[PDB]
Amino acid sequence: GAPCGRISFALRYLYGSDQLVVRILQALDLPAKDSNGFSDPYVKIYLLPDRKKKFQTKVHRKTLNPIFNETFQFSVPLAELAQRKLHFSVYDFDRFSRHDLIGQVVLDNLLELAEQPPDRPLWRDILEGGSEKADLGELNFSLCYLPTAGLLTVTIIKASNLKAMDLTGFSDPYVKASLISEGRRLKKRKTSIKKNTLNPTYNEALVFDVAPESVENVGLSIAVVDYDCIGHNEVIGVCRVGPEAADPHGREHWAEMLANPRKPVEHWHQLVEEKTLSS
Numbered sequence: 001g002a003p004c005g006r007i008s009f010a011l012r013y014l015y016g017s018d019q020l021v022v023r024i025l026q027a028l029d030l031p032a033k034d035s036n037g038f039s040d041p042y043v044k045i046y047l048l049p050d051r052k053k054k055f056q057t058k059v060h061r062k063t064l065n066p067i068f069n070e071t072f073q074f075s076v077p078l079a080e081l082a083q084r085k086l087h088f089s090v091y092d093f094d095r096f097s098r099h100d101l102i103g104q105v106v107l108d109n110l111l112e113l114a115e116q117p118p119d120r121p122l123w124r125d126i127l128e129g130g131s132e133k134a135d136l137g138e139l140n141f142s143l144c145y146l147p148t149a150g151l152l153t154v155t156i157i158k159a160s161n162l163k164a165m166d167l168t169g170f171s172d173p174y175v176k177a178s179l180i181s182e183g184r185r186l187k188k189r190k191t192s193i194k195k196n197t198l199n200p201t202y203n204e205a206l207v208f209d210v211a212p213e214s215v216e217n218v219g220l221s222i223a224v225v226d227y228d229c230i231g232h233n234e235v236i237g238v239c240r241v242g243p244e245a246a247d248p249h250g251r252e253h254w255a256e257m258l259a260n261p262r263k264p265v266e267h268w269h270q271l272v273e274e275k276t277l278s279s
């Protein structure tokens, strides 16, 4: 996707000193946030679930393609790397105004990313999507279409930094994928109701019958929902995927679902407030 800004880096994990190292290299095609058509980008870094534990890059002014070249060390036992996530928040720095969020990226299982290779840099697209003091969360899922059989399969993988929705302290999240074509909702499908977490893992496949002469014109709206009871469930966040999707990243994902027929494509998406789209 063209209008989709992205950032590159590299990371290795020195055992024997239990240290996750992370080099932020450079970003490209960042969104402008200044009236001058640019941004003064810098990136906050977290290592979930540790919410405070942040590093910050220098604040490169006037550029949509910063070259950070900064490195950061984290003390994590090998046993913990799996139960852990990196999380970058890209921001535009501002003098006279609240700093503008450019986007966020979530780094899934850190172990595998680091274990190899070294200085073949890896890229992730910066997830544009509203984030007030309270972020709704990111949702990870695959996407695989068998044209020969008309099976389109979603497969909800996991979610990160969901919004707490219960007084108890968390949310009892499940995921509602629903087929959309030309504004009409055609078919819904739910997942398990994993309870009392904000970083759920599903690995559950949702499947839809869709003719090959029709995929191009269909799409789906996924939405993480906090269970509550009987019929009073309250939504946490939503995300579109398919043509006619607001976010380029949203339709680039459906775009590459086709073009790679029997291959599942994994991608992170930013959960966004329900009232910024409309079926």
Ligand SMILES: [Ca+2]
Pocket: 033, 034, 035, 092, 093, 094, 100
């Ligand atoms: Ca600005």
Ligand SMILES: [Ca+2]
Pocket: 033, 034, 039, 040, 092, 093, 094, 095
């Ligand atoms: Ca600025």
Ligand SMILES: [Ca+2]
Pocket: 094, 097, 098, 099, 100
């Ligand atoms: Ca501002």
Ligand SMILES: [Ca+2]
Pocket: 165, 166, 167, 226, 227, 228, 234
């Ligand atoms: Ca609730």
Ligand SMILES: [Ca+2]
Pocket: 166, 168, 171, 172, 195, 196
């Ligand atoms: Ca509960």
Ligand SMILES: [Ca+2]
Pocket: 166, 171, 172, 226, 227, 228
């Ligand atoms: Ca609940």
Ligand SMILES: [Zn+2]
Pocket: 001, 004, 125, 248, 249, 250, 252
């Ligand atoms: Zn993208």
